[model samples]
Target: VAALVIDNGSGMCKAGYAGDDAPHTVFPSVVGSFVGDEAQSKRGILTLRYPIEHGIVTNWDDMEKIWHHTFYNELRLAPEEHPVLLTEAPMNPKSNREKMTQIMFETFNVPAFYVSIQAVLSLYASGRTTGIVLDSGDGVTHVVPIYAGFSLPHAILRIDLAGRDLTDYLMKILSERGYTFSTSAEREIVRDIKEKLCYVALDFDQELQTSSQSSSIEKSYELPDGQVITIGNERFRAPEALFHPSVLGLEASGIDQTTYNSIMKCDVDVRKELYSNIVMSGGTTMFPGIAERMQKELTALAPSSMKVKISAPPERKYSVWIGGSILASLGTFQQMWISKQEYDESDMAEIEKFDKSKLKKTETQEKNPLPSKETIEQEKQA
Candidate 1:
């Protein structure tokens, strides 16, 4: 039986059948709630609210609606026929997991359910059982260390500096520069601008000096109204906050320092492995020079004798989803899923027991090699 794999990210939800290279569906995690009388429905706009916070399902009603939409509308598959594999944020609440399990088995009548931490799946996506994962997404930036497919909870580090913060920072910069917006929807426009124009600076000072000397760094963006606005330094400066949280006046260690700190907390033998196999994932880490900047800063912060390496794959934003896809498709994973019958027989106290599984190393390369286009097509046909 093929499992349905889903990564419920704070920014977006990625869902699809296992064995696919990427998710077939990617949509905003925010759900639209309608208000006002039925008579005024036509004139009233639907209010949008998020069902997830920091990657946890906080609103069960909205979360259920999202699942209905995903299963019936998006994937157009019957949930009862397939087991579900869900990726959760690191340190997700136990209550949330129980609620998720209840909803899947009782509401959707799913046959089986399994939940795994996103960080570990990310490491699996990279085909490594041991390494340090740097995931900077919409809600938070997390540094988690994994050894033999198990995350070391004691070494996890996190910060509030991430995609949402960068978007807001860009909006503030643009507003101060005299850019005006007609409505609150412009936040989406601001996010687009951030994605299209932002990049991490390897040498902030040198880049600033060079940008100041030429107009080449500037780009013209047109609003929906056909009005044109020029974006210059805000492009790089916004994403630069990820490397330097002090710019946003947030008192916290930067990603590089946090990565170093997490690695040092681990045993000495694995420290070098963690340093050399740093895996980068998440939406915010997709900036053009982010991987390079991370390498440069990490090398400087690490002891000179230790080598520094950062592995960033394409479509980094969907790393967790891809990893889940790989895990769910494995032949051995079929037995690991907790069936509804098993859930009903188990004591409620057993719910506190974590449902983690250790992964066996494949004979493949450290970084999971993606299948070729033709191979994927052939697999699809067969």
Candidate 2:
């Protein structure tokens, strides 16, 4: 059966058919309401509400609408025919999972459903069943160790340093540098600046000194209204928070150190595999030097015998979505889906079977008549 794969991130949502390389629809998770056409025509100002908070569904109605749009308006598929495979945050609450499962069966009318943790899915995207998934997304950065296609939740580690925090930090830094904006649109502008210019520093201190002296490090960005502003060390400095949470005033280990610690928490046998298959994912990891920095940092921190290999696909940012697509497309995966009948009937034996007694019987006994005719000829010949 064709399946629907959805990766609903806190900041953005991706949805599409299984077997595809990427999501067919990608949109902000926030829903907005405009006052009137007058205001819309002028500045497109609209009051907004985020359906998801910290990777959990906060507003069911809004979340339902978003899914509806992704199904009908974007993919134009009938939800009843397709099995739905969804990604969930690591350590998602049992109550939220139940609510999500209920929504799929009742509201979407999906034939089958499956939910998987996003970090494990990211590992799957790298074509490996076991790995260390470092997912730095909008709300949080998680270092999850996977073994044999399942996540070790007990050893999972997360930090508050992520894309949202980095963007806010960028905004703060820009505002302090005499940059001002009048509209809510600047939030997106700030995100764009982060994406376009920022990168993880291999050596924050070394780069700091070099960037300070080299005027070549500064780059000018033109605003939407043609206001040009120059950015220097802040470009690399903002992403540095991911490696040093103390920069953001948080007492937490950076992603590389956290991943090393996470792997060490597991058994010694899997540590080598975990280090070798370190996969990077999430929008925050899309920075230019993130993978390199992670590889360098992890390699130095890992034991002398270990090999640190970071699997960063070109579609790393959408790795969870891609992995879900891969998982849903597997021939063996169909049996794992939560079927409609299973949801409706607590006991599978309660399902109705075909009633053979309801079929009409033949008027004559043809079975005995044909056997007798052949036997009669054989008897006469004997």
Candidate 3:
């Protein structure tokens, strides 16, 4: 039996049979209701509610509707026949997993299920067990450090700014340039436009000096209704907010600095591998020449002698799904799945330990070796 793989996101949900090349069914995670009153107190044409918020599932009932649609409408499969594998965003609340595990095992009547972290799954897609991942998706952008297939939790970082912010910025840019557009397919049109028109600046200062006069810098795009749009530097200017948050009036550091900041927070011994195996994945990270820009900027932030590498998979937008697909089908991974038997009879200890199991930290007070030495030195002085 093939395992069902799903990658959850605030923007869309990716679902397919395990071992498939890509997710066959991708749909918006945001669902609308007809009964809710309008928040703006205007005409109640359509009430909007999100099943997931910032990559965390908030409305369990609406989420059930999504899963039902995925199974019956899209895949045409019964829930009890095959095991399922679902992904969770970083910092997903422990209670959320508790809810998820109980729901899948009881309400859905699934044979087996596994909840996995997207950071580690993305690393698995790149065929690595150790690396730092830069995942900038629709909801959030996270810098996660992975070693030996386990994420270093303390070293992870997230940005509130993500693809949605970029889309909003592009909309603002277009509005200022004298454009009239109303929720193009309810906010997806601008996202499509951003994907087609935006790019990351490799060398900001040099390009600024030369781009002023280059006609090649300007380009025209024709809308579906024969509207001509001529964009000059705004293409680079919009995505530039990711690097220089000053562009968006935000104080957060650039992704480059954020990556370096995460590495500095990791164990002293694994910093070298983390630097050399930097991996970038997710839809927002699909910008052309983005890997090159990241490599260059991260190199600039590191010491003169340390090596920097960025692995940008061509199909990284689906890497999370791909990793789930592969992992769910592996022969060795069969034992790791949380079977219904274990969920009901094991006192629920396995479910609680799932997230921390990789660390194997059985000690009551596990401490960082190097940090402990520093603390010991302070005690000696006392």
Best by TM-score: 1
Cα deviation in Å at residue 168, candidate 3? Answer: 0.2
What is the C-alpha lDDT profile of model 3 across 1-382, one tens digit per residue?
6789978887777888877767877766655531111111211233456678788888998888777767776668898888999999988999999988888889888899999999888887777788999998887899999887788899999988889889888888878887764442324446767888888889877876777899988888766445577877778878888898778888999888899999999877899999999988898999876889999888888987789988897879878887787677666788889988988996122222233113212111111011122222333342
Model 2 backbone overlap count: 0
Superposed model 3: Cα runs more than 4 Å off: 33-45, 182-186, 346-382
Ranking by TM-score: 1, 2, 3
Residue pair clashes in candidate 3: none
Can you write out model 1's per-residue Cα lDDT over 11-38, one digit (the tens) per residue?
A: 7778887776777777677665421111
Which portions of model 2 show Cα errors greater than 4 Å? 33-44, 347-382
* Backbone-clash count (model 3): 0
Clashing pairs in 2: none
- Model 1's lDDT to the true fold? 0.78
Over the stretch 312-372, how does candidate 2's per-residue lDDT look in tens digits? Answer: 8877888898778777766567678899989998511111121223322312111101112
- Evaluate residue 335 in candidate 2 and report its C-alpha lDDT on the 0 to 100 scale: 72
